[PDB]
Structure 1
């Protein structure tokens, strides 16, 4: 037996509630995409359809095929009495061909006239209902308990849903255990990517999921008893003592240092986990990380050529009668200075198939579903394309999708004589020689803002490995403080492409005096003031603490009075219920992006965002070129400065004239 999940997914083709997709004679293919977890087995597959055929098609000579993976298992011909009203459709699918990946697509073949039919006509059309999709039930399988498939039993990069793995601790962690948990949590985030993370911690209890257990040979979580003492950090894959269906991950050691060493090995040496009970003895770094070298972010040392931006094999080309929209996902750091009116040029060298005659076909480059510019598609077949695309996103993932719109050439040809021909298809490819320029750009941005932090985590992800980062926690943190820390570092790890293994966590504010690093505030300050006046009072309340040493959830960020070059970030609450709603506010991207300014108070109903305090700037741009931007805004003042220089020239000329006369 075992637990089973009954998932329900609709057609992969876009179908907004305003209007569902229609299978016409020009595009009769509708594909459904799903993936397996490499651990579940399909027990019962069911497919439901609600189709309404037009009454202008022959019943017998019109059918639709159902494909699971390049094969058919049944057809559903339309009867004479079915052409008018809607009817349900039940089609079982044999669960034998579902190994790891399937493309369930349906094709429509129909006929409306015998002696002469016109392809891609309007009189024939098919549409499906809203509730039309596969109904397959998964089933948990007994894994062979092998550690070589890391991290497949914990996180398989094949699901479209967010993961949720708890991290049970030994109870009341200390200064030497929090940092190791952050390192492991961050490495999951660097692998989670856009799927999202959720890390609910526990204490002295074991859940019914694939959790992770931490032990230091002392104060074991009341189920690791009778285990002999270990002389080395041992990582096992023991199962749940009550049911052998979930897989845990215990980490052993002798003290705080031992567990930290084991955690670093997991996040770095993931390619040599063999068998079971893998031990690590010596893992040390050799070289630091160059600034702004996150794998997800595009590098600026030399212009890239879409070589590492493919992240797929058959993405830069399309085929078939209707070519698909080729898209490229790119992320850029938010440090690119604005107010330059320059843009980013392109060097696209796409090649296509020669059309027969001048069909006036056009190709348009779209950006975030917005029309930008269209070109011609005739070469009497390779065309150089240079364009500076404005209006980027600067922090969020912005796509550069563009499609190839082709009209049917010679639809009927002759009207008096019936002509029938097979539909001809064509291919298209963009090429890997197209480059974009990021050679010499300067880093400059107003620092006291949370939009950059909420989109890319700039105030903390300056270094890929987080060489300088200071986090403070109250003594003996409860579930809330650990829960909000693990998600936050995972958010930083998710945006970047390298786990944070060099960060540190302290327990008091005495060690941060004079330190040149990234100060981060997590926990709770005295919260007693009324709801009316948190806009201004909280500004000095947190500042007074940094210098020396129906719930509320406020995130703030201001200048750190230690270096005048780094930003502090503070997360405050009053009740554990506040932490839970604060985490839910940042986990989802639906409303988290709607957060700008310094102070962002989280309320039960809505989010009130405002900007207060004195702003400042970050980065190191040439001071000589700074005046160029300042003089740009002041047009009248620039003329006055030139006039003053010209007026002073006359005084020098008068003195020169007197000197010339005396000469």
Structure 2
């Protein structure tokens, strides 16, 4: 049984005195079956009296994880004497257990390294589990190696570390030399199998059965309705999708929808008191909004979440309660009472976005403790990734001012070691590390130096996302002395630390951005992401939406709430285009166009049935400047073509009701085109290839362009 392996892991962890493994195993055995006396006794070992009180009272998946997918970008790894460690990380869900795991390697040792002495080691969260010595027959040839992985040592989050220690000379070998290396091919990878378990129908660990942060793959939980949902039900589903997208984050969001059809995976079921789904028939009527989880009628391995309410208002209340907290999930059939309204949100208050009104310390930008430090012969570059609003604008002034406090080891040379600051892989400035020792006396034979630096960056172009990089480049002397009698310096590991007191400020920027620019929409959700809860957005959805339109709306709202750090609890989904007249908000149109906005002549592309037309700009440049050129973006020709092919596009134009407000519409003509539009929307890689004002999505790919009038949104004072 799986619980037997869980208890074996439990006793293994206590034998190794590792609290992380045992705690995860307990969480798992309690998830699968918390009723047996064994789990309550094991929890007693891990207050203590309560455990004694209650004590007295499947399908499997085979996956391939090659180095080309879960390694640094190039995939291939080169291990040297300065960077001999290489890590590969993967995660296991809390509802699945790994039975068999195998590691396959394909490496080529350098021809010059000494045999036997040079060996390659593997570490699965430490726990040295084998060494691979280098023989004479494999000194300079490609080798195939296979080594099993013990399943009992695998936890929720774990990595495998490849340590390469090698030598090429007995005496006077040069460190950091290129003669020693060990290239690891990208074809190498792991080989493990996961097995699902029939977890208990308990809502206490919400939403682990439906979404667990341990899984690093895309979260694709579907949704099921009764068919042709009403306006309020669409709003509730959009709110739930936004909350789930915010919770998932960068994993990827995809919410397929079904109409009165059972799914084949964990899904959310929306069922009012009336028009109940066919499989939910004979469920007793409810008087209050209630949330419960029920097993799939066919197999118990699929867990379904059912949201029940008297009417669409109760469903909206339940969705708003789910988006917020204080629900206190426990057992099943948890009811949601009146939910307090959310407090008003200041613009640009997204939790993910870095604060702009006040200086931001490096401590809050740090995600894990070991991010702001490095060690080794050549310390690794410290990377600090910060998400920024996409409308930051600089108007002839000093840009990002940042104070840096750092600690570094004393360099061997006086005035050679430098610290390099790079933004978006662009060199910014260099600072020389001080030293108090001459090189001539280095052949003769304890503190840590401190440093303070003030840095100002022009930063004309920032973008939706960016990262920093601090490179500490030392000079390491080679062996010297006389030729007949040489002396080699023993390598010493040097540590570089960036203090948390370092602050970065963006208070000298302005919220100005040319429009229409859907690249910011693709990367940050602008302008709907200006309000974290989407309190200034109206969604125009077609009457009686089909599956494709519901899926497109769900995916768009999920990605918008994923780029933003907060769910959209105040989104307003409408059914007709007449109500948006005389309103001050950003209108997002899904699958179609209102007749009043379709003949305003600001539209640069309109796909209607088999006929579509586009306004070609005058001249398109691959790399535009900061200031848009109106002459270049002026329309030149309008060509209309008709064909049976499937196509979709996303366009943006100024709202005809307000100068500041903007309208972005997603349009499709055929179900295939809807499929391609969904795929482009939910895919992060494809969504980053769109810019300008019109972005067509054909089978070849996405070919965007910029055309039309330019309207500026924001506040810009005198100059």
TM-score normalised per structure 2: 0.79
Is 2:539–2:590's contact at 8 Å kept on the other side of the alignment? Answer: yes
- State the distance in 2 between where 1:110 and 1:623 align: 65
Q: Residues 341 and 559 (structure 1 numbering): CA distance in 2 closer, same or farther, change over 3 Å? A: same
Q: Distance in 1 between matches of 2:461 and 2:387?
A: 9
CA contact (8 A) 1:12 1:31 kept: no
Structure 2 distance, partners of 1:527, 1:602, is 23
Deviation at 1:402, TM superposition (A): 2.0
Specify the SS of the correspondent of 2:596.
coil
Deviation at 1:418, TM superposition (A): 6.1
Question: Which digits, 9 at most, give the CA deviation of each residue in 1:100-145, with x for residues without a partner?
Answer: 2323112233344446655545444322333222222222122222
Name the Cα RMSD after superposition.
4.3
Q: Is the 8 A contact 2:156 2:214 kept in 1?
A: no
Aligned residue among 415, 424, 428 for 2:483: 415
Q: Whole-Å Cα distance in 2 between the matches of residues 246 and 610 of structure 1? A: 44
Of 172, 179, 201 in structure 2, the residue corresponding to residue 145 of structure 1 is 201
Deviation at 1:577, TM superposition (A): 1.5
| Contact kept in structure 1, 2:404 and 2:502, CA below 8 Å | yes
Q: SS of the counterpart of 1:508? A: coil
Query: Within 2, Cα distance between the matches of 1:44 and 1:416?
Result: 57
Distance 1:129 1:531, change over 3 A: farther
Aligned-partner SS, 2:594 = coil
User: Structure 1 residues 273 and 403, CA, compared in 2 at 3 Å: closer, same or farther?
Assistant: farther
Whether the 8 Å CA contact 1:565–1:618 is kept in 2: the answer is yes
The answer to whether the Cα contact below 8 Å between 2:120 and 2:165 also exists between their aligned partners in 1 is: yes
Q: Is the 8 A contact 2:534 2:571 kept in 1?
A: yes
Give the 3 Å change call, closer, same or farther, for CA 324–333 of structure 1 in structure 2.
same
CA deviations 1:448-480 (Å, max 9, x no partner) are: 222221221222112111112211222211111
Distance 1:546 1:182 in 2: 31
Q: Which range moved further: 447-456 or 121-130?
A: 121-130
**Displacement of 1:167:** 0.7
CA shift at 1:265, angstroms? Answer: 0.6
Label 1:413 to 1:152 Cα distance change in 2 as closer, same or farther (>3 A).
farther
Deviations 1:502-557 (A, max 9, x none): 11112223322312222222222599999999975749999999999912323222
Residues 150, 270 of structure 1: 8 Å contact kept: no
1:44–1:541 Cα change, 3 Å: closer
Inter-partner Cα distance in structure 2 for 1:378 and 1:351: 12
Q: Secondary structure at the match of 1:121?
A: coil
Pair 1:197 & 2:261 matched: no
Q: Contact between 2:67 and 2:76, CA under 8 Å: does it hold in 1? A: no
Q: Distance in 2 between matches of 1:346 and 1:24?
A: 35
Alpha-carbon distance in 2 for matches of 1:86, 1:544: 55
Pair 1:598–1:233, CA change in 2 (3 A): same
Alpha-carbon distance in structure 2 between the residues aligned to 1:517 and 1:220: 35
- Cα displacement (A) at 1:179: 0.4
2:672 maps to which residue? 577
Partners of 2:166 and 2:611 in 1: CA distance: 73
Offset, 1:417: 4.3
* CA deviation after TM superposition for structure 1 residue 184, in Å: 0.4
Partner of 1:459: 527
Once structures 1 and 2 are overlaid, which stretch shifts more, 98-107 or 290-299? 98-107
Distance 1:224 1:518 in 2: 38
Separation in 1, partners of 2:68, 2:379: 17
**Contact kept in structure 2, 1:11 and 1:31, CA below 8 Å:** no
Q: Structure 1 residues 377 and 522, CA, compared in 2 at 3 Å: closer, same or farther?
A: same
SS at match of 1:190: helix
Match among 470, 475, 482 for residue 543 of structure 2: 475
| C-alpha deviation, 1:446, in angstroms | 2.0
Partner SS, residue 301 of structure 1: coil
* CA-to-aligned-CA distance 1:568-591 (integer Å, 9 cap, x gap): 222222212111111222322334
Deviating more after overlay: 76-85 vs 209-218: 76-85
Deviation at 1:559, TM superposition (A): 2.2
Q: 1:445 to 1:530 in 2, by over 3 A?
A: closer
Give the 3 Å change call, closer, same or farther, for CA 180–542 of structure 1 in structure 2. farther
CA distance in 1, matches of 2:331, 2:101: 35
Cα pair distance change 1:502/1:41, threshold 3 Å:
same
- 8 Å contact kept, 1:14–1:21: no
Which stretch shifts more, 360-369 or 59-68?
Answer: 59-68
Choose which of 596, 599, 614 in structure 1 pairs with 2:694: 599
Task: Provide the rounded CA distance (Å) in 2 between the counterparts of 1:474 and 1:466.
Answer: 20
Distance 1:100 1:514, change over 3 A: same
Distance of aligned partners of 1:131 and 1:572 in 2 relative to their CA distance in 1, 3 Å threshold: closer
Larger of the two Rg values belongs to structure: 1
Q: 1:428 to 1:270 in 2, by over 3 A?
A: farther
The Cα of 1:596 is off from its aligned counterpart by 2.4
Could you say what secondary structure the match of 2:431 adopts?
strand
Structure 2 CA distance for partners of 1:588 and 1:273, relative to 1, 3 Å: same
Q: Distance in 2 between matches of 1:324 and 1:454?
A: 32
In structure 2, C-alpha distance between the alignment counterparts of 1:379 and 1:550, rounded to whole Å = 69
User: Given the superposition, is the C-alpha separation of residues 121 and 620 from structure 1 closer, same or farther in structure 2, using an over 3 Å criterion?
Assistant: closer
Verify the 8 A CA contact 1:12 1:32 in the aligned structure 2.
no
Farther off after superposition, 162-171 or 555-564: 555-564
Distance 2:173 2:709 in 1: 73
**Cα offsets for 1:263-295 (capped at 9, x unmatched):** 111110167222322211110225211121111
Asked if structure 1 preserves the Cα contact closer than 8 Å seen for 2:512 and 2:713, the reply is: yes
CA–CA distance in 2 between the matches of 1:441 and 1:225?
Answer: 58
Does the Cα contact within 8 Å between 1:12 and 1:33 map onto a contact in 2?
A: no
Q: CA deviation at 1:484?
A: 0.8
2: distance between equivalents of 1:358 and 1:508?
A: 73
Contact 1:13–1:30 at 8 Å: present in 2 too? no
**CA displacement at 1:19 relative to structure 2:** 9.0
1:158–1:613: structure 2 CA closer, same or farther, 3 Å change rule?
A: same
Cα offsets for 1:81-103 (capped at 9, x unmatched): 34354332121121111122323
Q: Distance in 1 between matches of 2:73 and 2:612?
A: 53
Which sections of structure 1, spanning at least 5 residues, go unmatched?
Answer: 625-663
Cα gap change, 1:360 to 1:498, in 2 (>3 Å): same
- C-alpha deviation, 1:173, in angstroms: 0.5
Q: 1:38 to 1:313 in 2, by over 3 A?
A: farther
Alpha-carbon contact 2:67-2:75 (below 8 Å) kept: no
> Quick check: 1:172–1:477 contact (8 Å CA) kept in 2?
yes
Q: Quick check: 242-251 or 510-519, which moved more?
A: 510-519
For structure 2, the residue ranges without an aligned partner over 5 or more in a row are 1-56, 437-448, 616-642
Cα distance, 1:499 vs. partner? 0.4
Please, which moves more after superposition, 609-618 or 294-303? 609-618
Aligned partner of residue 489 in structure 1, secondary structure = helix
Cα distance in 1 for residues equivalent to 2:600 and 2:353: 41
**SS at 1:455 equivalent:** helix
Give, in whole Å, the separation in 2 of the partners of 1:120 and 1:107.
16
Mean Cα displacement is larger for which, 453-462 or 507-516? Answer: 507-516
Equivalent pairs, count: 624
Cα distance in 1 for residues equivalent to 2:644 and 2:101: 63
- Secondary structure, counterpart of 2:405 in structure 1: coil
Contact 1:550-1:604 at 8 Å conserved across structures: no
Mapped contact 1:395–1:455 kept (Cα < 8 A): no
CA distance in structure 1 between the partners assigned to 2:116 and 2:342 by the alignment: 73
Q: Which moved more, 1:570-579 or 1:267-276?
A: 267-276
Asked if structure 2 preserves the Cα contact closer than 8 Å seen for 1:331 and 1:395, the reply is no
Residue 214 of structure 1 deviates from its aligned partner by 0.5
